[PDB]
Tab-separated table of N, CA and C and ligand atoms in Angstrom:
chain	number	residue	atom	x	y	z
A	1	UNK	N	-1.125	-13.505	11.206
A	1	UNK	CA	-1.449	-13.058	9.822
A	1	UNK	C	-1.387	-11.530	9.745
A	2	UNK	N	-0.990	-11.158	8.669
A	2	UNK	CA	-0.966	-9.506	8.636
A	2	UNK	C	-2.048	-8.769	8.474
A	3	UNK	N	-3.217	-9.371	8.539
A	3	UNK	CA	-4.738	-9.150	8.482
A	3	UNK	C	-4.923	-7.864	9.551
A	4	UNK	N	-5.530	-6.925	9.408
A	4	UNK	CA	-5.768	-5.389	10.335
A	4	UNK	C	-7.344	-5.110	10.373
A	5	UNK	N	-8.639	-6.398	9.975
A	5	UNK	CA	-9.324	-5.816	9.878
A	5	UNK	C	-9.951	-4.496	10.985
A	6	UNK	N	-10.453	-3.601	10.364
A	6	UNK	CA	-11.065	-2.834	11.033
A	6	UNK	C	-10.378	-1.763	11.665
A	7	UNK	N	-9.513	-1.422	11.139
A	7	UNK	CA	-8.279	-0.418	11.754
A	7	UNK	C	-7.364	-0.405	10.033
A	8	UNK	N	-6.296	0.711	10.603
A	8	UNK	CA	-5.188	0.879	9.698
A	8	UNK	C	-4.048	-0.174	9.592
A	9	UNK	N	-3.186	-0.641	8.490
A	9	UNK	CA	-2.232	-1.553	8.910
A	9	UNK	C	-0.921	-0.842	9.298
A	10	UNK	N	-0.552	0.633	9.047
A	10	UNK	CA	0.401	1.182	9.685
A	10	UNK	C	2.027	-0.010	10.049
A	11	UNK	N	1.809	-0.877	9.135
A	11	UNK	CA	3.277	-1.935	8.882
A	11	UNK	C	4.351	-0.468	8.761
A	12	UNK	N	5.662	-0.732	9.295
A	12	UNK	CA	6.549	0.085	9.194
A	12	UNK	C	7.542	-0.648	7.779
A	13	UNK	N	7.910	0.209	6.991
A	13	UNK	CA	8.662	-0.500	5.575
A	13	UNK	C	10.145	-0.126	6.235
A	14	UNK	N	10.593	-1.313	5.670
A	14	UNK	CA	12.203	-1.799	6.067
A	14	UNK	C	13.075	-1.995	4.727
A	15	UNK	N	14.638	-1.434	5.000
A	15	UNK	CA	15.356	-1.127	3.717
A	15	UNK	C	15.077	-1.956	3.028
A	16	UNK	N	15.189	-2.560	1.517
A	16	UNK	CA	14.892	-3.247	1.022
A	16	UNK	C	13.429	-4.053	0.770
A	17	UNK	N	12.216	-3.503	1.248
A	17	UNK	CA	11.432	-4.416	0.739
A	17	UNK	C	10.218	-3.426	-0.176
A	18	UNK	N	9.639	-4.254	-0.619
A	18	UNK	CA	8.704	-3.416	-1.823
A	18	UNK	C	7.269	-2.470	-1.042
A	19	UNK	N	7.271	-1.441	-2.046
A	19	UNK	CA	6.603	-0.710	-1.580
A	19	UNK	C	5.488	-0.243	-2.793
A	20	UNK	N	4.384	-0.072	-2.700
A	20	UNK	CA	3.517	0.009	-3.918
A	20	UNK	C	2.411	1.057	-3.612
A	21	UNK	N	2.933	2.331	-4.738
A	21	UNK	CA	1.891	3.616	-5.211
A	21	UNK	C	1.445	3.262	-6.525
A	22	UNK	N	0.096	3.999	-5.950
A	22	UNK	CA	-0.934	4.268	-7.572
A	22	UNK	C	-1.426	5.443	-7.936
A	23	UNK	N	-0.843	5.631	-9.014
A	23	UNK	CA	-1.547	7.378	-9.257
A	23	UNK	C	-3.039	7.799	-9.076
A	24	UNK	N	-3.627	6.889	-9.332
A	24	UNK	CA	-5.197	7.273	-8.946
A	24	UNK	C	-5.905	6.608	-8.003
A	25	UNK	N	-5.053	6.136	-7.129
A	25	UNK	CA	-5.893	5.524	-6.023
A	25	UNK	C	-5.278	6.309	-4.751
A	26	UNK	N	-3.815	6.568	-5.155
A	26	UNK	CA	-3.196	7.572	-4.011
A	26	UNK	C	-3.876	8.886	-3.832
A	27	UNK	N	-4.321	8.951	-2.329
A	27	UNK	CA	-4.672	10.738	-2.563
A	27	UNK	C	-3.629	11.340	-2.548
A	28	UNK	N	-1.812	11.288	-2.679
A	28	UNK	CA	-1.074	12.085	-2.819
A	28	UNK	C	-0.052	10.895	-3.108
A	29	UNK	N	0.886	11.253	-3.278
A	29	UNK	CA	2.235	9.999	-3.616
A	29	UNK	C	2.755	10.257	-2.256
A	30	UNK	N	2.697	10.185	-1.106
A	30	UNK	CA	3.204	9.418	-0.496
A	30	UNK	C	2.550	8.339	0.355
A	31	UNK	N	1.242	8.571	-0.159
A	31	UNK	CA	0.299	7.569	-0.107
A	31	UNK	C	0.734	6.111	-0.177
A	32	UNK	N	1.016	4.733	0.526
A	32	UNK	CA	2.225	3.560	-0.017
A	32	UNK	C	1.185	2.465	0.523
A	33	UNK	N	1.259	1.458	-0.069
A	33	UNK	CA	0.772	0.100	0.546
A	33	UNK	C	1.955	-0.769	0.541
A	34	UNK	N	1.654	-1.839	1.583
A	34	UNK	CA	2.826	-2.991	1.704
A	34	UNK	C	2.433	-4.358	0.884
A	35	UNK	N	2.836	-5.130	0.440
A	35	UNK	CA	3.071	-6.268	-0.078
A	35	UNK	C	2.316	-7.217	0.227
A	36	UNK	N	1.799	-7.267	1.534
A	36	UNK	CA	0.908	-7.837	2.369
A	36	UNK	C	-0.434	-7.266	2.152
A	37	UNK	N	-0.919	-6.446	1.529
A	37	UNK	CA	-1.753	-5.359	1.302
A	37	UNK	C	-2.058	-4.992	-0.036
A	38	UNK	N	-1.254	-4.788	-0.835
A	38	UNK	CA	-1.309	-4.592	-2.469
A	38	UNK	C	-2.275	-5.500	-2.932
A	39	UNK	N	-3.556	-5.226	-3.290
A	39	UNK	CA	-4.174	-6.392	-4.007
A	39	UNK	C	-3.807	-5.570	-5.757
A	40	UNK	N	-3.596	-6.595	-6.370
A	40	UNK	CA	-3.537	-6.246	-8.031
A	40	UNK	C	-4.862	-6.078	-8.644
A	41	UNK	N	-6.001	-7.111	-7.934
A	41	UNK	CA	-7.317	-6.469	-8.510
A	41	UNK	C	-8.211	-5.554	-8.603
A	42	UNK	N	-7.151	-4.382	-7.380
A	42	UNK	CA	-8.049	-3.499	-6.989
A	42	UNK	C	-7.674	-2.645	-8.024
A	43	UNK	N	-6.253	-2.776	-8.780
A	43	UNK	CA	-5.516	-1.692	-10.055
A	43	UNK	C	-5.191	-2.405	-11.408
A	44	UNK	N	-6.025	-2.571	-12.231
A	44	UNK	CA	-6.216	-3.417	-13.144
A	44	UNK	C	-5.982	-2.249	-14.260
A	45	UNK	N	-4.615	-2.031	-14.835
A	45	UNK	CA	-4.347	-1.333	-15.498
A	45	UNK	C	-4.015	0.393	-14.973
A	46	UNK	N	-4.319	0.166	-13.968
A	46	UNK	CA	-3.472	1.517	-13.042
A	46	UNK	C	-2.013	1.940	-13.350
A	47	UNK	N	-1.805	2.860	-13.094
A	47	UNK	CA	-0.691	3.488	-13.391
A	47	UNK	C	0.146	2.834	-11.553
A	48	UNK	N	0.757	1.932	-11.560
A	48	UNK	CA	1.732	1.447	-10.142
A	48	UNK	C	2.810	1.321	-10.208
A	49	UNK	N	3.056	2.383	-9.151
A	49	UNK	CA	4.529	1.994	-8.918
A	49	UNK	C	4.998	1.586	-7.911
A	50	UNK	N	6.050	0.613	-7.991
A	50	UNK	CA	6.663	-0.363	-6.787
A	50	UNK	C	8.464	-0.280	-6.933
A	51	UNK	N	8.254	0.267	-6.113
A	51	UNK	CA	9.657	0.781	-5.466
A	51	UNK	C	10.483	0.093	-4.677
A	52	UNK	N	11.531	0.143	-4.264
A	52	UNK	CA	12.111	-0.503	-3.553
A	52	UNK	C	12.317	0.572	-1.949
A	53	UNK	N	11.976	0.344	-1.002
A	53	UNK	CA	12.553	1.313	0.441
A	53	UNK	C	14.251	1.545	0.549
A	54	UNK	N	14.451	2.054	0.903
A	54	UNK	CA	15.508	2.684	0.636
A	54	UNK	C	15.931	3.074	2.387
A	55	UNK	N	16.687	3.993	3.015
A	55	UNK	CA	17.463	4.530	4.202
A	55	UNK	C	16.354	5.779	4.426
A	56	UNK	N	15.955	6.683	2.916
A	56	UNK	CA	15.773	7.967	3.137
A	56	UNK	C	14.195	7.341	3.119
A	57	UNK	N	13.407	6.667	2.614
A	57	UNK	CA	12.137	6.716	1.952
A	57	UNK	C	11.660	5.703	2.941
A	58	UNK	N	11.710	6.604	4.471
A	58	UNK	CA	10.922	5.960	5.446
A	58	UNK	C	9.692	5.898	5.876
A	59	UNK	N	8.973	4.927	6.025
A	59	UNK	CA	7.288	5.130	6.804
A	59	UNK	C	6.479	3.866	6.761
A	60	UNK	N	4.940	3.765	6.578
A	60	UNK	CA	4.015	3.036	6.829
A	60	UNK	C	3.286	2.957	6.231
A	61	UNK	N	2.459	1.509	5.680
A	61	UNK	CA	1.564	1.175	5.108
A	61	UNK	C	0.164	2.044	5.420
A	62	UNK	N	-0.757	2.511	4.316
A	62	UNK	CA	-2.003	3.414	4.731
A	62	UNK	C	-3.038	2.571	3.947
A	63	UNK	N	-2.777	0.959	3.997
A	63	UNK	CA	-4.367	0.465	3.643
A	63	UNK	C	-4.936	0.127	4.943
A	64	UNK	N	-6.023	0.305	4.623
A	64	UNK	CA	-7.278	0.530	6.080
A	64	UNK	C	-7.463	2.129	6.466
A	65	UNK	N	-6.636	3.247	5.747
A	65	UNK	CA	-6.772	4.708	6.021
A	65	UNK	C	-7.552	5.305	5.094
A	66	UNK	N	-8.397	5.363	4.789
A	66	UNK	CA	-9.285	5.439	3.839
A	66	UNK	C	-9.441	6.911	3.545
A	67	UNK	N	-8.484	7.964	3.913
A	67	UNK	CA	-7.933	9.365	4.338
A	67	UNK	C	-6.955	9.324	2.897
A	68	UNK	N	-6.464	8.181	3.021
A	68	UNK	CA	-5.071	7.825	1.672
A	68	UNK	C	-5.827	7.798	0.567
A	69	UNK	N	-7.020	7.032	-0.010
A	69	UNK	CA	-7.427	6.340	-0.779
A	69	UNK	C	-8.791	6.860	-1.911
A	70	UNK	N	-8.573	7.312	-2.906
A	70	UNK	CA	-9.733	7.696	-3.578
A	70	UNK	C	-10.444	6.758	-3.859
A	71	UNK	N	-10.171	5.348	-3.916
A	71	UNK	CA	-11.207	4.211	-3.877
A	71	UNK	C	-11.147	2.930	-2.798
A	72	UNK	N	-12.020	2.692	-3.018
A	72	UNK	CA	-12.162	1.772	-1.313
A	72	UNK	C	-11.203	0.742	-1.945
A	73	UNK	N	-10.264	0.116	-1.154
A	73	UNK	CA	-9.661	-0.439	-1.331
A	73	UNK	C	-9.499	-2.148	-0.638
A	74	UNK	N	-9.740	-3.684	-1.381
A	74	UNK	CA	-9.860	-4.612	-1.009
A	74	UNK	C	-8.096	-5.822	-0.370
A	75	UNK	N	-8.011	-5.481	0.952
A	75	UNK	CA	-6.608	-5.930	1.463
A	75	UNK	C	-6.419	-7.549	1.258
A	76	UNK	N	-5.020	-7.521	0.708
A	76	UNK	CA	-4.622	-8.677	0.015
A	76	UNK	C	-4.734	-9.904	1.054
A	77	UNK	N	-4.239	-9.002	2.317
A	77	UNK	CA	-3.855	-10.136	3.612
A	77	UNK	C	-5.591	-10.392	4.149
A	78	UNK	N	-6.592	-10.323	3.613
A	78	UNK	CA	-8.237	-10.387	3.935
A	78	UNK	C	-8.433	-11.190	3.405
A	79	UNK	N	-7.200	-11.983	2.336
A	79	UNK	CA	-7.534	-13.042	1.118
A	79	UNK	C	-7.139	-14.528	1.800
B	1	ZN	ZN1	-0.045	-3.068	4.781
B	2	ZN	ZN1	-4.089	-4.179	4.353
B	3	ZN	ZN1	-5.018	1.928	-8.168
């Protein structure tokens, strides 16, 4: 299961799959959660954006980094 309790999930994003920022939950935009991770209830009318990964727009999931996050954030894969 993609479950990380108690640590960071640090998932590496691969071309093509979705990637999801929130303007006010990101402490910066490159702040990203993975798919596995995105809960929708935690942004209930948030400003989100979900992107697609790309070649150039490489890196890692930062739910469980609480360094990323202006609000505590509840992981989808915990569901
Ligand atoms: Zn993740
Ligand atoms: Zn997570
Ligand atoms: Zn949010």
């Amino acid at each position: 299961v993609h479950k990380h309790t108690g640590r960071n999930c640090g998932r590496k994003f691969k071309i093509g799959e979705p990637l999801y920022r929130c303007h006010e939950c990101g402490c910066d935009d490159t702040c990203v959660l993975c798919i596995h991770c995105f809960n929708p209830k935690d942004h209930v009318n948030h400003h989100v954006c979900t992107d697609i990964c790309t070649e150039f727009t490489s890196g890692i999931c930062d739910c469980g980094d609480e360094e990323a996050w202006n609000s505590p954030l509840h992981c989808k894969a915990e569901e």
